[PDB]
Design a protein around this ligand. Structure first.
Ligand SMILES: CCCCCCCC/C=C/CCCCCCCC(=O)O[C@@H](COC(=O)CCCCCCCCCCCCCCC)COP(=O)([O-])OCC[N+](C)(C)C
Ligand SMILES: CCCCCCCCCCCCCCCC(=O)OCCCOP(=O)(O)OCC[N+](C)(C)C
Ligand SMILES: Nc1ncnc2c1ncn2[C@@H]1O[C@H](COP(=O)(O)OP(=O)(O)O)[C@@H](O)[C@H]1O
Ligand SMILES: Nc1ncnc2c1ncn2[C@@H]1O[C@H](COP(=O)(O)OP(=O)(O)O)[C@@H](O)[C@H]1O
Ligand SMILES: [Mg+2]
Ligand SMILES: [Mg+2]
Lengths: 571, 571
């Protein structure tokens, strides 16, 4: 694991609060040890000799001592809570910051519910780090002073206490591995249940439309039964651990009283001294038993931290990248696919020996039937995925030798589905560019024909868009995406079926807009309708991951090939 | 509370378990009380008279008593754990079933992360119904016997130890409202953080493409900071509660020893009797303080249960329906919209004064631009939403007097976006009628051309599909949706732009299949391309929630209106 080393890093700045906690703990333990002698003073001196005034005076003094140690415990609890909140905040921030940067094949291969559950199985790390748990660990460490004093008082009774301690330590090891496995098994089942719940909430309209509420109930019921079986198996290990710990504690107390009474009879002690030993055992055995009782909480936190570190061990997208050529400053130039092969993991290949050469500052089209792999080409250009064979070149430089930030800032991608995040229209338009002038946003919205309906909104570029832009129409969200892409001022523009829901008036406006750009930006159009690609320089027809033919519209029509058949059938 | 009544009713079948728990706890308390007298015999008979053999015999007897007590505690804990598992099972299943049965307006106004947080906050209820918390409540209940014995032994010390109980009650009452509010605030902030994380996971492609990882880290960091502040505010209420209860406990113990020593000096008790009284306080004051120490868990579980009950108080999709007429068994008739007005919530109207009749058994096309209200019309026909004014009449009877099962069993909807759930291809194609004959799936799949590509799969119809059908292209998913809708054998078939991604050959085959039906199945085709509605019987044009042009293709062209303009522009 790396979490123990990472834990020490968090406490490095706080080298002054830890000292205060240590000193407060020392004072608290010393005051408790001092106050443990009250029963000895009662039974050896005050009760035997009937000293009422001394009874009152020493009782008040010990009450004052107890109040002092309570005030000390209040002081260190605040510092411990502050440290716990700081550590938990750092852990959560690091995990989210890392999970944002992971490669794209991580999100494809993982259900949303799994990631959500892994993130939200982190409140369990707060519980084992909160004010009371760290206080109990500190008391367990401080129990050394109590043990030393107990040895100073009696030897045989200290050895009995030591045997009790060893029996505590033996039980912990036996229940260490079984409790982790039981806590890990329930976490996976909880992740599966959360994934099922998320998936059922997603397709609730389809569930209702088909009357599939009962089947979903049965499936989630089976998952709940699995979770409850895991929890029950994990919940009976706690019963065995608690029963063994209670046996040890109670029998050790009875044995200590037995041996102390034997010593008192033999004359090696007195009743007051034995009672003081029993009272001082609260600072040698009680903290240890409290730690053993908290052990399941620590095991749950450790399992959750290990599950988080499983994600944190994955290398991010920038860590899998070869060195970047600093001479490349712009992505303007010819785009070439050189024998590109790609398959989504280990399945059948999607692209087989792909060969394009898109001239710089030219508008080209990639067309084909659904599933041919046009969006896969667009995502390879965006460098979401890497070709298994061949390479993609921009102006003679491999796309793997260009910095990822430059690639993702100089290439604009408009997808089939538009993602609208919770915020105003202004915030959605300025995504990743929250320092742009307002006039530029107006210019982009006008260029994408999005200004007209935005100015008709109640807030006029401040309208809080709900989740997934429900209040926005299907063709209104596409115009927002196109405006967001144009606001980027890119060097390569990819329109992946961005005009499917737009009307003729709007599509003509956007067509002139992307036609009116400088003769240095490359516009790549991925379209399913052939009526929107007639006036572009070159058209590549993709048929199951292969450029079977290419050329302008006139040349493709004057070939009587697959493109001519597509044009005749689709028109 | 209402939630408490449900949990108590969950205990009605399990009545013999409760009796066994009660008897075992009675025996446990009696044995503990009997064993608390060990220190009385030590310090009054065995030590005073130096009896050694009697010391060994009595110590062995009390060790046996303690072992019996531990065995009884083990048995009772097992029973309590099983009871708590059953209760939590029932709670989870009830909440999931209800949330599945909720109306479509609930899922529109709520983010997914809120529902997922509310469901998984039920893990907080599991802690309060654990095998250790219920044991502490039962011990607190049984503490009445210990209190009676303390009163019988010494009235003065019992009165002193009774004030400690009152001070616990006052401290708990004072810290009752503040603790619940902090828990609600923390849970709300956690729900917001979960919603943010879910939304970020959904749109990871856009976030990566626009370089918004840094911008998305600031929002989530702010939400994490809000959660941390809310947690620290609750973490200081617990510190105050613990400090006050510790003050009461320690000062009460010191005062009890003080007054006991005074009584022993005055001759009202003996040295052994005072120690026996203090040992017997482990069954009067210790259970109460242990219960008070669990106030955070109980309050957190109460808040979580209240949050669940907030959802459970909703009226579902079937309790809002009127008295359904049972004389309707088939939705075969003229569908009519009579002055139907509808708006999504309090926003602008979507459909205004729609008059639209659909002849029985004919094919009808509804067309227009995006945002016109076509999918809204389809969802109104499916009873997903209710019109504000006017009625929908599938036949002479209104559609709100038809059973909701019949509406969702005789009308098939093929939405624009196809939802595929994690399972086999055969499991997805049933989705509501899993008992379909295996030969009936082939007939539906061959009608939708889904059989050809399904046969070219590893496990054929048993091939496992991902959570979103990533391995299936858009055309394949649309064909699966069409096959699933046809497999239902409906009376009204709504094709909501289902053939947008389909090939010309596939579209022609599916249109041929649609042509050949029972001659009484009404087909509604919501289309964006006007070339796919040429041969349909009647066409309605939607212009911002108004039916402006109606008629066949020849009449609409002959009218030379809005539909003529759309035809000229698009084709
Ligand atoms: C499921 C359970 C069912 C069965 C359980 C069976 C349990 C077995 C129970 C056994 C009871 C033991 C009886 C002790 C009574 C002492 C009598 C005595 O003479 O005192 C002697 C102390 O004797 C010792 O030194 C220590 C002996 C006890 C071992 C400690 C066991 C720890 C707690 C056990 C927890 C068990 C938990 C087990 C967890 C698995 C005094 O000796 P001395 O000569 O005066 O000293 C000389 C001093 N001088 C040199 C200064 C002069
Ligand atoms: C602020 C938080 C502090 C928490 C502490 C709570 C404890 C409060 C309890 C105070 C009550 C103190 C009562 C002391 C009783 C006492 O100290 O006295 C006992 C009387 C028994 O005496 P009695 O049975 O009558 O014997 C004959 C003797 N005499 C009458 C002949 C003198
Ligand atoms: N996220 C994914 N994981 C696995 N396979 C995928 C994924 N996305 C697409 N595929 C498969 O790879 C092929 C690529 O097609 P796609 O990129 O969707 O092109 P188009 O835009 O023409 O649909 C599809 O046939 C699909 O089955
Ligand atoms: N879940 C929703 N919440 C609020 N408004 C919505 C929702 N769904 C649709 N609308 C609004 O209702 C109108 C009708 O849209 P819709 O009929 O779904 O589009 P289309 O006709 O292209 O299918 C749209 O203008 C949209 O703003
Ligand atoms: Mg695509
Ligand atoms: Mg629609």
């Amino acid at each position: 694991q790396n979490m123990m080393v990472k834990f020490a890093g968090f406490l490095k700045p706080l080298k002054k609060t830890v000292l205060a906690i240590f000193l407060a703990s020392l004072l608290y333990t010393a005051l408790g040890i001092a106050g443990s002698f009250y029963i000895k003073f009662l039974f050896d001196d005050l009760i035997k000799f009937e000293k009422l005034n001394d009874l009152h005076i020493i009782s008040a003094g010990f009450a004052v001592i107890f109040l002092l140690q309570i005030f000390l415990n209040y002081y260190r609890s605040i510092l411990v809570t502050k440290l716990g909140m700081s550590i938990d905040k750092s852990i959560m921030m690091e995990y989210y910051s890392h999970v944002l940067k992971l490669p794209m094949n991580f999100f494809n291969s993982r259900k949303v519910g799994e990631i959500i559950s892994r993130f939200m199985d982190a409140s369990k790390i707060r519980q084992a780090i909160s004010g009371a748990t760290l206080t109990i660990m500190i008391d367990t460490i401080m129990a050394v002073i109590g043990g030393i004093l107990l040895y100073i008082q009696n030897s045989s009774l200290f050895f009995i206490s030591f045997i009790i301690i060893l029996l505590y330590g033996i039980i912990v090891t036996v229940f260490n591995k079984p409790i982790q496995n039981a806590n890990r098994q329930i976490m996976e089942d909880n992740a599966k249940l959360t994934s099922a719940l998320v998936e059922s909430v997603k397709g609730i309209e389809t569930i209702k439309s088909f009357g599939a509420e009962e089947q979903t109930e049965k499936s989630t019921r089976d998952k709940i039964e699995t979770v409850m079986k895991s929890s029950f198996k994990e919940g009976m290990l706690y019963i065995n651990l608690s029963s063994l710990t209670g046996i040890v504690a109670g029998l050790g107390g009875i044995v200590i009283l037995w041996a102390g009474a034997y010593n008192v009879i033999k004359g090696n002690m007195s009743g007051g001294q034995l009672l003081a030993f029993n009272a001082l055992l609260a600072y040698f055995l009680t903290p240890v038993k409290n730690l053993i009782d908290l052990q399941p909480l620590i095991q749950t936190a450790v399992v959750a931290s290990n599950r988080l570190g499983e994600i944190l061990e994955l290398a991010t997208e920038k860590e899998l990248r070869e060195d970047s050529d600093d001479f490349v400053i712009s992505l303007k130039g010819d785009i070439e696919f050189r024998n590109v092969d790609f398959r989504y993991g280990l399945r059948k290949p999607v692209l087989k020996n792909i060969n394009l050469t898109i001239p710089k500052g030219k508008t080209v089209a990639i067309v084909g039937e659904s599933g041919s792999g046009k969006t896969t080409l667009a995502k390879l250009l965006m460098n979401f995925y890497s070709p298994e064979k061949g390479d993609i070149l921009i102006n003679g430089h491999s796309i793997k030798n260009i910095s990822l930030e430059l690639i993702r800032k100089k290439i604009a991608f408009v997808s089939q589905d538009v993602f609208i995040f919770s915020g105003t229209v202004k915030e959605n338009l300025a995504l990743g560019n929250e320092n742009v002038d307002m006039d530029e946003i107006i210019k982009a919205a006008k260029m994408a024909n999005a200004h007209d309906f935005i100015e008709k909104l109640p807030l006029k570029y401040d309208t809080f868009l709900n989740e997934s832009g429900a209040n926005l129409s299907e063709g209104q969200k596409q115009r927002l995406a196109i405006a967001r892409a144009l606001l980027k001022k890119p060097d390569i523009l990819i329109l992946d079926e961005a005009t499917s829901n737009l009307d003729s008036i709007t599509e003509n406006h956007i067509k002139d807009a992307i036609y009116g750009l400088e003769d240095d930006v490359t516009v790549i159009i991925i379209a399913h309708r052939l009526s929107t690609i007639v006036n572009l320089d070159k058209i590549y027809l993709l048929k199951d991951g292969e450029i079977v033919e290419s050329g302008s519209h006139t040349e493709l029509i004057a070939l009587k090939g697959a493109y001519f058949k597509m044009w005749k059938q689709t028109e």
